[PDB]
Design a protein around this ligand. Structure first.
Ligand SMILES: CN(Cc1cnc2nc(N)nc(N)c2n1)c1ccc(C(=O)N[C@@H](CCC(=O)O)C(=O)O)cc1
Ligand SMILES: CN(Cc1cnc2nc(N)nc(N)c2n1)c1ccc(C(=O)N[C@@H](CCC(=O)O)C(=O)O)cc1
Ligand SMILES: [Cl-]
Ligand SMILES: [Cl-]
Ligand SMILES: [Cl-]
Ligand SMILES: [Cl-]
Ligand SMILES: [Cl-]
Ligand SMILES: [Cl-]
Ligand SMILES: [Cl-]
Ligand SMILES: [Cl-]
Ligand SMILES: [Cl-]
Ligand SMILES: [Cl-]
Ligand SMILES: [Cl-]
Lengths: 328, 328
């Protein structure tokens, strides 16, 4: 069985470029007993891959998750036709012994795109769920600041916060994204590229400050928000996408006098802290909320495996409205 | 009755120098009913004063706490001879209505210097107690990193950590402070000014990394420690003394990739979060541990109120062995 694979040709320097990637074709070996052949249906690209790539050797396959189908099987538990979540990296076909696969929720209806299993009802949505509910620890009535708010993580954060009775202020990177989050029920949404002053916009959005900060961006954006956190405010550090492609030193941290006298609690997290049973319960909640209309979503589906680098680079730049997914 | 007062003549640039301070002599107003006249016995100088000074107007009294004796009284609860903690600033004599004064522990013995009420068995010791036990949440068997470790905060952090069954690594600025903390039972103590590599020294001190970081210093030192924190490691942000006297650009924040991958919890605190009740129980614990020999101490007593600016500057620069105190 042939396969195509995207490899890291050269470690990224700044933003990735086309030349940093190399497509290779190879033939996979026959299956051994207990193994399955997986055909990728949908492949995700996500900001963490800009960081995780630094641990690869040049020539290695780019890491990542996909929704795949078993197209040949010598595994009793995994017959032909089985849909799984797998992480063989950026490849069209792969062989698995089954150990590391995750199966689709049995509740998964044929009325919603399978690509959502990589987004809203997948690891980004779970990142939003646990970051907001357990790290921010919202109980209701808080004012929550969320950046990269039209991303797959941030848009779930804001919609769950509304369900919990919070006020939500969201920062986005385009005018279309403003309308999107307006439609989704955010209390305040602004385009951070076009406001005159981030400081003044955040102050008008919540004159008495912010209880919780769900931080995907980092850098100077976060320095500005930290200056508007209430005493004992909570920051959930999910990502720092404004920094991952840096070529020079990081910006200065926030003035320590602010952090100390406001007695801020800042905790970083990764979704895999929560184990399988907790993630399954949360995925079922996310799916129920989607089917009830309480969580809406947008996807940016790009056709063609050959476009996966372009998908990744466009996503890193914020060029796309909705979760970026490649359809094989 | 006359008083001498140290005022801020010029806002500090970098570290203070002598010409930034001005000593003034004035006559205090007569005592009204319910008031007491307080004579300073011991006055403390502490790093937070360097930051708090930025908010003063030129001519204002420098802020700070002292142990004082009631020498004239119209307040039945505070007869002449009563010893109190008071915060009138850097002044030899002051008037109080009594409302914010604190008597010492009832069981305070005459075998313990009164000046310890400004150190090990006072606000520095309480900062150490709550920061380590509640913000870091040590439970036993952890490895603790503490910097500015020979101050009253740091020395109490290390000795409480030892009595809880932790390993403690301390960073100090002089060889004499290395010997002091070695005698106090710190597992590893190093002079950060003379090591070839802070990264390598911290690695040798704890090859598997740090569970808890009690941080008084901040800046680049803390960025290095953050790269050696264990997964779910906890940072108690008490101070950032490396930034208080630092000219020029502020230091970069820590690499977000490390903070997020290690899922660190970083919380700032001030001792005033804990109300007078819980502070009293902690103070009793500290006194009992001093009397049992589980917490030892060293003070650097400078004679003469006229030497208080010099005491402050030497303390800021790390040049004094033991908590710096001025004896009036
Ligand atoms: C899979 N996962 C959890 C997660 C987080 N950090 C990791 N870091 C590493 N090194 N390795 C991992 N596997 C990893 N996984 C995810 C995936 C995507 C997003 C995320 O932020 N995605 C963007 C995608 C933006 C877009 O598609 O436009 C978003 O805003 O939702 C977060 C967590
Ligand atoms: C009173 N207190 C709490 C505290 C903290 N920050 C504040 N900040 C401000 N602006 N105002 C306050 N009153 C204040 N109080 C204290 C006092 C001293 C130390 C302290 O760290 N002292 C040094 C003294 C160092 C030395 O003498 O060498 C130490 O390391 O023990 C900490 C907290
Ligand atoms: Cl190119
Ligand atoms: Cl390499
Ligand atoms: Cl997987
Ligand atoms: Cl966005
Ligand atoms: Cl819930
Ligand atoms: Cl300065
Ligand atoms: Cl130090
Ligand atoms: Cl020290
Ligand atoms: Cl000594
Ligand atoms: Cl991880
Ligand atoms: Cl205890």
């Amino acid at each position: 069985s042939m396969t195509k694979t995207w490899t890291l040709k050269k470690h990224f320097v700044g933003y990735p470029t086309n030349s940093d990637f190399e497509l290779k074709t190879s033939e996979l070996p026959p299956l051994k007993n207990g193994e399955v052949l997986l055909e990728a249906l949908f492949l995700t690209v996500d900001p963490y891959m800009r960081v995780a790539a630094k641990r690869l050797k040049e020539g290695d396959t780019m890491m990542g998750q996909q929704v795949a189908k078993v197209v040949e099987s010598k595994n009793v538990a995994l017959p032909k036709g089985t849909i799984v979540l797998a992480s063989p990296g950026w490849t069209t076909h792969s062989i698995s012994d089954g150990k590391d696969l995750e199966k689709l929720l049995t509740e998964w209806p044929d009325t919603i795109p399978l690509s959502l299993a990589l987004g809203t009802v997948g690891m980004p949505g779970l990142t939003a769920y646990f970051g907001l509910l357990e790290i921010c620890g919202v109980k209701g009535g808080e004012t929550v600041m969320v950046n990269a708010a039209a991303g797959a993580v941030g848009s779930v954060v804001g919609q769950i916060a509304k369900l919990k009775g919070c006020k939500v202020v969201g920062a986005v990177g385009s005018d279309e994204k403003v309308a999107y989050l307006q439609k989704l029920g955010f209390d305040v949404v602004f385009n951070y590229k076009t406001v005159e002053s981030l400081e003044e916009t955040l102050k008008k959005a919540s004159p008495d400050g912010y209880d919780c900060y769900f931080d995907n961006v980092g850098g100077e954006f976060s320095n500005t928000v930290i200056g508007q956190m209430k005493k004992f405010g909570r920051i959930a550090i999910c990502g720092a996408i404004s920094t991952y492609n840096r070529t020079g030193p990081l910006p200065p941290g926030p003035p320590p006098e602010i952090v100390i006298y406001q007695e801020l609690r800042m905790e970083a997290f990764v979704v895999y802290r929560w184990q399988g049973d907790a993630r399954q319960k949360a995925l079922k909640d996310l799916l129920k909320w989607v089917l009830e209309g309480k969580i809406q979503y947008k996807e940016y589906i790009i056709e063609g495996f050959e476009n996966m680098p372009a998908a990744f680079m466009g996503m890193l730049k914020g060029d796309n409205l909705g979760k970026t997914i490649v359809k094989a």
